[PDB]
Ligand SMILES: OC[C@H]1O[C@@H](O[C@H]2[C@H](O)[C@@H](O)[C@@H](O)O[C@@H]2CO)[C@H](O)[C@@H](O)[C@H]1O
């Protein structure tokens with residue numbers, strides 16, 4: 044108080060911060076408190092069940108909040124917010140059971156080393172759950188819908204084997220504003236919801252995380268907005284690591300906001316997700332370990348960019364991220380379904396085998412980009428052409444092999460343009476080829492070898508197949 | 522537990538025993554660094570209080586321990602006979618006032634599986650303090666680190682012994698490359714799911730304690746650059762101004778080298794090429810040797826050497842193949858000097874050569890390689 048004295052907090056919304064405790068602004072008087080099987084019910088409409096504030100080292104077992112009065116939640120004897128906790132480092136909640144209406148449990152600020160084990164938190168049904176407005180939450184969380192567990196301001200409670208039911212948002216977690224401190228830790232959550240109603244399971248704001256999936260979960264009914272994860276403004280240095288087993292049924296994995304990918308698949312057991320689920324937004328995946336697929340399928344007519352693309356029955360639609368996707372899952376080939384797959388800006392092609400009845404087209408004067416060594420093969424495609432730009436722009440100094448066994452038309456441009464001091468081998472097999480020069484370079488000498496085996500080629504350049512910036516190692520024509 | 526010298530000590534048979542949510546703290550860290558552990562393995566001779574000590578084959582499971590104000594959070598020794606006894610710590614919450622600490626995990630002759638929870642630190646001594654200290658862990662041992670590193674910079678690892686055993690298993694490094702230090706890179710055995718595009722070198726201002734993967738914290742020597750690039754999948758090496766030198770044969774990763782620095786092999790040493798791919802020196806202030814052949818190739822895989830800078834091997838060769846090799850050498854502009862561009866120690870090595878510069882030893886245009894090399898192409 045102003046005079047210097049202290050008054051017990053009676054304000055319902057108040058919770059002490061670590062700062063408050065350091066400022067002398069707050070002094071906790073909560074120690075040596077132990078709870079075993081306490082059952083707490085409230086009249087409908089009561090704001091908060093339990094305020095676990097300043098309870099460092101305090102413990103709980105079988106704390107049970109809320110009554111399953113009946114089907115209508117508006118008249119059920121449970122609180123809007125089950126539990127609100129802060130300044131409780133080292134506290135332990137064993138087998139906590141909460142029946143809530145708006146928010147299950149909220150953990151804010153200092154809770155270092157605190158654990159919540161085998162919690163069973165559930166909204167009493169999901170009826171109108173999507174309309175509940177979170178009461179205690181981080182500023183970055185502006186969506187409407189009930190939230191089973193909310194965590195922010197640097198709280199890093201360990202969640203072990205929680206069972207979360209009937210929630211719009213299973214977990215909403217924000218890292219500390221200043222440095223993204225506060226790891227989101229959930230080990231094997233058992234997530235379920237009637238009629239598959241759900242918005243997100245893990246809504247992560249400015250944070251890192253380590254989550255192990257237990258083969259249990261789902262994503263909501265909205266074909267566009269609902270996803271297991273939503274990564275909002277997670278920093279470039281953050282990582283949201285996913286381990287374990289994906290749900291049996293198809294789900295949409297991730298959506299987000301922000302300029303940095305942070306999701307990591309760490310030996311994640313994908314089950315049949317490639318065939319029945321969706322990645323959602325590939326942009327947010329940072330890296331993949333121990334998850335491989337042989338082929339990436341593209342369908343410019345019937346594809347869907349929400350798909351993983353690694354299963355033939357669920358191809359993606361555009362070429363934008365094909366290099367990224369092949370790098371992530373180590374794909375050995377790309378299959379182009381019938382139709383023209385097109386780009387309007389410079390796009391990287393992975394060094395793999397391209398096959399299928401589709402065609403590749405570079406429009407708006409764009410070029411396909413080769414940024415890695417290896418062999419790029421176009422086999423039996425309906426052709427590849429550009430509307431004016433060079434077909435392949437090489438920006439790697441590593442050995443590049445280009446193997447075209449389909450029709451090739453670069454018009455007045457080159458099939459290959461080396462932007463560096465390159466090392467390229469190009470080989471055209473049958474079909475046809477057209478270009479002003481097969482291989483060229485922007486400057487300082489590029490070594491190349493060439494084989495052109497087709498009668499349908501620009502015969503006028505047989506004697507001079509490459510520009511002056513390219514020196515030939517071999518030339519097999521005629 | 523509130524203690525003065527040692528919090529808890531676990532010895533010999535404790536199979537399947539568990540210690541969950543332990544809260545162990547010294548009552549403050551004043552003079553904590555002067556405590557002498559009472560019950561400890563013979564291999565632990567350091568001075569300082571120890572929160573948890575384990576040895577003689579004890580393998581207690583520590584789940585979410587909270588450890589405070591300790592010089593040493595954990596001291597663990599594997600069994601003397603066969604290194605039996607896995608050190609298991611899941612999500613430790615480690616803190617200490619004033620950042621005072623010596624080591625969090627002091628591991629002797631053992632393996633370990635540790636998951637970090639984004640909480641921790643390393644001591645104030647810029648040379649000796651480190652999260653891990655691996656003492657004589659055997660070749661077959663693995664000390665695996667998963668989870669999130671602390672937010673603030675820390676020195677990750679130091680050790681004694683001849684075998685690297687640390688493993689970064691998808692470890693979330695945060696901003697450690699920029700604000701922290703690896704400490705002693707020798708002790709890292711392998712890395713999974715952690716990458717960096719560029720390794721930075723600075724022979725004048727660099728510090729070998731650094732990771733080297735962030736431009737503001739470059740390393741200093743060339744000794745471990747191949748190992749670092751292999752570990753983190755770096756695509757290039759940036760040489761800050763000054764001469765980066767070796768005095769013993771040292772391997773160079775097959776990547777793009779850039780920057781104003783120069784490369785120099787002294788004491789008759791050579792740069793080693795032990796992997797296929799393309800080694801590119803682009804725009805450097807030059808590469809030269811004081812007498813040894815410049816690049817010694819010991820791999821039979823296709824090797825491309827792309828030099829776009831000044832090259833001077835003096836009376837020696839630019840490339841010497843120690844095996845039956847397959848090499849493509851291309852010198853671009855600048856200048857090149859040597860007695861032969863490529864040579865081989867024995868039974869024929871195939872090679873392709875391109876030299877585009879007027880400043881070269883014209884006298885060997887007609888015989889650019891020794892007798893043990895057969896040319897696939899020659900563009901001069
Ligand atoms: O090169 C820097 C980018 O790396 C991308 O990750 C790659 C990863 O390096 C590679 O090993 C493989 O897993 O493919 C990934 C993506 O295709 C990052 O996603 C990107 O952020 C950059 O850091």
Ligand SMILES: OC[C@H]1O[C@@H](O[C@H]2[C@H](O)[C@@H](O)[C@@H](O)O[C@@H]2CO)[C@H](O)[C@@H](O)[C@H]1O
Pocket residue numbers: 685709710711712748751752
């Ligand atoms: O070749 C044996 C050595 O491997 C080194 O690890 C390599 C690893 O093989 C490679 O995959 C990548 O991770 O680069 C590492 C560079 O260290 C071990 O460190 C070394 O002890 C040997 O086993």
